[PDB]
Amino acid sequence: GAMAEYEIDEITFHKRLGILLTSWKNEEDGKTLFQDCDSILVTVGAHDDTNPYQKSTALHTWLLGYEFPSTLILLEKHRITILTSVNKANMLTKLAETKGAAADVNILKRTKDAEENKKLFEKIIEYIRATNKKVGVFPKDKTQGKFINEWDSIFEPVKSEFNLVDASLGLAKCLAIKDEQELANIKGASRVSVAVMSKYFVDELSTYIDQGKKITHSKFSDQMESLIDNEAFFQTKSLKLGDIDLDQLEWCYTPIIQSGGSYDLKPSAITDDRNLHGDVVLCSLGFRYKSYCSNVGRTYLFDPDSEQQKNYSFLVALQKKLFEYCRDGAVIGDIYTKILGLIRAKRPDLEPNFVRNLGAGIGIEFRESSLLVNAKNPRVLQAGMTLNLSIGFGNLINPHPKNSQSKEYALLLIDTIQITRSDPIVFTDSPKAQGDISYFFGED
Known part of the structure; x- marks a missing residue:
């Protein structure tokens, strides 16, 4: 009922991802706008028609053409990882071997097993440790729900291992x-x-x-x-x-x-x-x-x-x-x-x-x-x-x-x-x- 058609535009995704990456990899911008992060962590919870305007959801709209609720993205300079439901993930799969790729595309599929799902979240934490441990976030953003609650359960106890920084302005320059x-x-x-x-x-x-x-x-x-x-x-x-x-x-x-x-x-x-x-x-x-x-x-x-x-x-x-x-x-x-x-x-x-x-x-x-x-x-x-x-x-x-x-x-x-x-x-x-x-x- 009111089921939509989604055309995920792989060309525009990589065009735009590359715009973002070019700036992040610029010595100046990387230090100034992205505050020397090695990763950018972006999460989107359940749909909230109460704040339609967020850097997080704007990123979705800009890269993917649409907002994907209850999904996690970890941007790295060499790779973008998107963690979502199998059904959402299957839509994104076409981004992963485009010839004009701006980065490696790493799609992690959430299943119906809590434990597996946890292993998927744990992968994200591992990617971050392998870095300088400065994590770009959009601090003004707020989200909520089941997905988010799982993520918090896992991240919050290990979060002090990292240095969270505002990369807000690096996205802003792109948008x-x-x-x-x-x-x-x-x-x-x-x-x-x-x-x-x-x-x-x-x-x-x-x-x-x-x-x-x-x-x-x-x-x-x-x-x-x-x-x-x-x-x-x-x-x-x-x-x-x-x-x-x-x-x-x-x-x-x-x-x-x-x-x-x-x-x-x-x-x-x-x-x-x-x-x-x-x-x-x-x-x-x-x-x-x-x-x-x-x-x-x-x-x-x-x-x-x-x-x-x-x-x-x-x-x-x-x-x-x-x-x-x-x-x-x-x-x-x-x-x-x-x-x-x-x-x-x-x-x-x-x-x-x-x-x-x-x-x-x-x-x-x-x-x-x-x-x-x-x-x-x-x-x-x-x-x-x-x-x-x-x-x-x-x-x-x-x-x-x-x-x-x-x-x-x-x-x-x-x-x-x-x-x-x-x-x-x-x-x-x-x-x-x-x-x-x-x-x-x-x-x-």
Whole structure:
């Protein structure tokens, strides 16, 4: 029931494994990003739809094309060992004698005998001892279950024999540069996001406000989210989505909706239970296509006043300059500082209101934290990277409000972009001029 077809792509597995190995075997990277490990240990437990974003599961998606629950990988420079169930293992078997192999492929099959299975785990420990005993791990990852429990039973008592180190960033560097298929996936996701936004959301939003509909943000948000189960919606032709495999579509997160003078410009914002107010309305939404993430976010103004329109137009102008700065060879922290600098030159008054970062990288993971766009990031943008770019202003105080009105507002723009050898590609682009996103009572 709902049994899928899996095409394990042996070519892409070795291409990508080799990218990883080349960097690990680089003296610099090996010392810096991989912290001088001789092995990388990666485990994935039972499926947990509670954290969809992990280095561990991203590794799976990147190497194998899919997440394999309850499996263990031990990467070595000369060999990759994957320990899984017989049925999963048989799928991976084709990786083991490809002519274009990047490494030895060592597949260990879990059976139905506890003791044998234990012997398999014990092999892993033995491989590690034969090394410098520095083991690369992804420390922020968390997993759980039966498989994991067995592994712990075996590893934890012998674990002090080893030196566990963070090789997180060596993977990050690999994942950061997207190939042609990956970019395609992210563009697809982006296309769905912006279509839902431009078409479903703005429609709902505008009629609600118009028709004085009393709806909570959470209600509305949940309404949006439930849209995914309505495939009729995605076949709407005006949505030029005809080429999207709807069965490979998911939400990145629960859409964030905000109004009525209470805002949170962090992607971790949870949509409250307060009623939608027709003043300044923020929306963030993103889809995940074939396991690649996207994000879009927009501001809508209802009967905005002059200073509100001015601030919103300045944000648009700022984001434009942001795109322009996002080019191959640019230092990330310079980009932030240059934007801050534009504020101080033209709208210094706005500086206390300015976001502390401008988002981060995006791909398999919703957030590639190595590519956090803040002042301190010394990393350099390269062609083929993808960014989930966020820019905005918070706690903007309304000067003169009659008391049927919100004291404060915020402004936000998010788009997903690809770094090129020139100007970036803004996959999630849509008209965002004040006139596009402004509504005036009486239908103006």
